Amino acid sequence: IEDKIEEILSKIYHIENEIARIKKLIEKVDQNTADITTNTNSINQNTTDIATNTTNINNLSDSITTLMKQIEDKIEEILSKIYHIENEIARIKKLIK
Amino acid sequence: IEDKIEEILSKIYHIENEIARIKKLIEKVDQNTADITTNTNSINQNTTDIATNTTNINNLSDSITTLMKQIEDKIEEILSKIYHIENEIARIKKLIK
Amino acid sequence: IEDKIEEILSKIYHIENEIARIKKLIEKVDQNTADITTNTNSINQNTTDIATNTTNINNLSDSITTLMKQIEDKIEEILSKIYHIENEIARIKKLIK
Ligand SMILES: [Cl-]
Ligand SMILES: [Cl-]
Ligand SMILES: [Cl-]
Ligand SMILES: [Cl-]
Numbered sequence: 442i443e444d445k446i447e448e449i450l451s452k453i454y455h456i457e458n459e460i461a462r463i464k465k466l467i468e469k470v471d472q473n474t475a476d477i478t479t480n481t482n483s484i485n486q487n488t489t490d491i492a493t494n495t496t497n498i499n500n501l502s503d504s505i506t507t508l509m510k511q512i513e514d515k516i517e518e519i520l521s522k523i524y525h526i527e528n529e530i531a532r533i534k535k536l537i538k
Numbered sequence: 539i540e541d542k543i544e545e546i547l548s549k550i551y552h553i554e555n556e557i558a559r560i561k562k563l564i565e566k567v568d569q570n571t572a573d574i575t576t577n578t579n580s581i582n583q584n585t586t587d588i589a590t591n592t593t594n595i596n597n598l599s600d601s602i603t604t605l606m607k608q609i610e611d612k613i614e615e616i617l618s619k620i621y622h623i624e625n626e627i628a629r630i631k632k633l634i635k
Numbered sequence: 636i637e638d639k640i641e642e643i644l645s646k647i648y649h650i651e652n653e654i655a656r657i658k659k660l661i662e663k664v665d666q667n668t669a670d671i672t673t674n675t676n677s678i679n680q681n682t683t684d685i686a687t688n689t690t691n692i693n694n695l696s697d698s699i700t701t702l703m704k705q706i707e708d709k710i711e712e713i714l715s716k717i718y719h720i721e722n723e724i725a726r727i728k729k730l731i732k
Contacts, residue, residue, distance in 0.1 A: 445543060446639055450608045452550055453646055456557065463560055469567050470660050472668065476574045479672045483676045490588045491684050497595045498691050505602060505699065512606075515613045516709060516715050522620055523716055529627050530723050535729055536634055549647055553713050556647045556654050573671045580678045587685045587688055602699060609703075612710060619717060626724055633731060 455640050458573055459557055466563055466567050466660060470663050473574055473667055477667055480577050480674050482583060484674060487570060487584050487588055491681060494591050494595055494688050498688055501599055502695055508606060512609060526720060529684055533630060533727055560657055563664055570667055570671060577674050577678060584681050584685055589686050591692055600695055605703060630727060
């Protein structure tokens with residue numbers, strides 16, 4: 442019995458050491474949670490800025506699109522009237538001679 | 539007393555089992571921390587590339603802006619001359635006849 | 636001995652309260668794991684959308700590049716035609732007089 446007790450006390454001391462080492466994790470789980478929140482903030486930040494960038498790419502693209510469609514057709518008109526002027530000038534120079 | 543001991547031994551066996559299961563978190567908390575760091579690497583990277591993309595949507599926009607302003611102008615003055623040449627060909631043809 | 640036992644029982648009750656307190660962390664470790672996976676999902680999404688935005692900025696840029704090169708070309712030739720038309724309108728007007 443005195444030996445039962447000695448043994449029993451030993452088992453107990455070994456255990457309270459083990460619980461010593463498990464209380465380290467209270468400190469650690471805590472900082473992890475703090476970080477998951479920080480990482481989460483950062484993600485949301487990034488999700489908005491992709492949204493702002495997305496919005497601008499699709500705008501910049503659409504406005505270029507339509508504007509140049511319209512330049513190409515000044516230049517279209519313009520090249521026609523230039524031909525047709527050069528016709529004229531050929532025929533005026535004929536008539537003088 | 540002998541009953542006091544038996545009880546005590548039971549409480550102890552139940553405990554060392556409890557502690558077996560809690561030992562399992564030493565792994566989990568360690569995996570999780572490694573991951574918060576990996577997730578944090580990834581974020582910072584995305585953060586940079588949103589920066590590079592932002593920078594371009596701002597540069598691309600500015601260079602388009604100024605180029606087309608200049609072009610629409612060169613077309614404006616080109617179209618002016620042309621109309622005015624069309625005037626001078628009308629009036630020349632009117633003098634020949 | 637009876638005092639050894641009383642002590643031993645005390646150490647035990649204190650301990651099981653420890654283990655009460657420490658089973659607190661299980662729900663906290665596994666709400667954190669849930670979250671690391673969520674944050675990890677969200678990263679992967681952001682990563683792709685930066686990819687889609689990147690792809691387009693490079694596209695928008697490349698298409699503008701080449702188009703203006705080609706317009707600036709047509710205008711390079713159109714402006715020649717125009718000089719050379721003003722030449723002949725000068726010379727036509729000098730022949731009429
Ligand atoms: Cl972006
Ligand atoms: Cl954790
Ligand atoms: Cl995270
Ligand atoms: Cl991200």
